[PDB]
């Protein structure tokens, strides 16, 4: 009843303290999101402009945004109208509100993915394990209709059907689109989406560490220097006759 399976720790190329994200993997991940997950999952906090200089060129980013129709207005008649996307636009929501979302998913609500790797214990390790971990329920267990068995999901009956399989898409960079390859990439992308400052954060950590080592030593010496006066100080009691 209180049983749970915890994901193993995968050696992500961005796991080390000075390890940046593999941008090729993040670019591929974006494709997986755009072509598969975005049909049910929103990513409210990422805009097409965020891609520029990270995974795409400004031109590519502009194109990506124009592929979408966004609502704007009101116009001169107080009317709402549609228009092509702009890099300043955020990724499109698949549904108007959670009610509609559930309504289109057997009452299950696909969560926004902007911070999903930070809102789940295990982060990408868990998301990867979940995506690549569906299987038949063990003896004595029956999943209700509409749910699917997944040992990694708490309770083990998830409302999301396996989203990815081999060649469910073709990476325009030529990488062999195998299920695990796909999971790996989208998870990398998810890490990025959740913490766009990932890389810069680590570059700073590098300098922080060096400056700190240096500064700590210099100040240690200065403290010892000043205190030497007292540290080596000698005294005696010379009472009279």
């Amino acid at each position: 009843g209180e049983l749970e399976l915890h994901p193993p720790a995968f050696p992500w190329s961005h796991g080390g303290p000075l390890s940046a994200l593999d941008h090729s993997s993040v670019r591929r991940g974006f494709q997986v999101y755009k072509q598969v997950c975005s049909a049910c999952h929103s990513m409210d906090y990422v805009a097409f402009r965020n891609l520029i200089g990270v995974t795409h060129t400004e031109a590519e980013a502009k194109a990506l945004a124009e592929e979408v129709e966004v609502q704007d207005g009101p116009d001169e008649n107080g009317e709402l109208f549609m228009r092509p996307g702009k890099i300043s636009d955020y990724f499109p929501k698949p549904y108007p509100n959670p009610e509609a979302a559930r309504a289109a998913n057997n009452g299950a609500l696909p969560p926004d993915l902007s911070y999903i790797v930070n809102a789940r214990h295990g982060g990408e390790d868990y998301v990867f394990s979940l995506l690549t971990g569906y299987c038949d329920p063990p003896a004595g267990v029956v999943v209700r209709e509409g749910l699917h068995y997944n040992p990694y999901f708490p309770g083990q009956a998830i409302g999301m059907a396996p989203p990815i399989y081999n060649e469910i898409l073709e990476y325009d960079d030529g990488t062999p689109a195998t299920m695990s390859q796909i999971a790996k990439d989208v998870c990398t992308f998810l890490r990025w989406a959740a913490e766009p400052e990932h890389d810069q954060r680590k570059r700073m950590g590098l300098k922080m560490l060096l400056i700190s080592a240096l500064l700590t030593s210099l100040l240690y010496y200065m403290k010892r220097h000043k205190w030497s006066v007292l540290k080596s100080r000698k005294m005696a009691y010379r009472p009279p006759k």
């Binding site: 959740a194 913490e195 954060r201 700190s212 700590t216 000043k226």
Partner: protein, 380 residues
Amino acid sequence: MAPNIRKSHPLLKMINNSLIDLPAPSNISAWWNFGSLLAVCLMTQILTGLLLAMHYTADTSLAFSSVAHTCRNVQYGWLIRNLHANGASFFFICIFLHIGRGLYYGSYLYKETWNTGVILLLTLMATAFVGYVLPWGQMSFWGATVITNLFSAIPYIGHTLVEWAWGGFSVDNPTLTRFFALHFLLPFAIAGITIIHLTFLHESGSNNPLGISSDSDKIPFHPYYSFKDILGLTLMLTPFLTLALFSPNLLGDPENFTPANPLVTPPHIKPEWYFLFAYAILRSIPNKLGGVLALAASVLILFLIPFLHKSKQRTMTFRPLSQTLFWLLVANLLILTWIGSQPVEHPFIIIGQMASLSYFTILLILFPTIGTLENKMLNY
């Protein structure tokens, strides 16, 4: 009047009498560093806090996202947010060690300094609480619900006070906007009371590790402790920054990356690490009001410490029995912290009650008892 400005000028006179010519014991150890570190956290929290406040929006429909806007769009917004969030933790690490030092070395015998010190802890705690609500994630909401509902345990006026505090029938927008105001204000009450703390302290100057008068061996605060303190600062700044830059979320609940949902309560509602031990104590007594009292006492007990001193000696430096007793207490707090992060189920529930019980026992009975016993072994 005076040949040198450092002493005559009405303002410099003050800086000089508290940070330059101030007489300090020659032998105070690293345990005397946390006072100035605490003062630096305070100034640091305030600085980063204002920076964050300048991009924050206190409305339940915009809180969570304005924080995201801060971390995603504001130049170095993410950095400032990490430093503020983790700075809160460095603050509590420092306050706990500051208190520990005090208990061990009998600093509490400086009653007014000690008592204002307890007020400072209480104020810092309220600050962290109202501050933690602002991002308005699941943990923010539900923790604020669990805590505010504690007050409803008070007989008669309880329900009334709670709804009053909330500004409605539950934690909601009016609770959020008033919490923001409070969070903005309190840090300054903390700064003000710190001055009172230091003012009472200077009536006697610092205590020292041997607990014997140091009038025969004092030294100017500068440069001895100004240098020693800057060193202490950079030594504790490395872990802070390492955590902040290499493990930003090591100490936080992932549940707080999910917008508050009034209709869904997280499976495991656990508080921030620095409030765990107190939570453990709250749960030890299965009775709603009894748990509140236990919690209250768990902190107010600190006001009693000065009256439970039976030793003829001030510090525990030369008191081996009290020293063991002291570390038991520390370990006991470790256990409570651990127990506070687990679910209410065997064996935790019993381990929890034991630790709670021995916590109060060590402070209320063993310490004074052993103190007396030690005086006799010295033939006093």
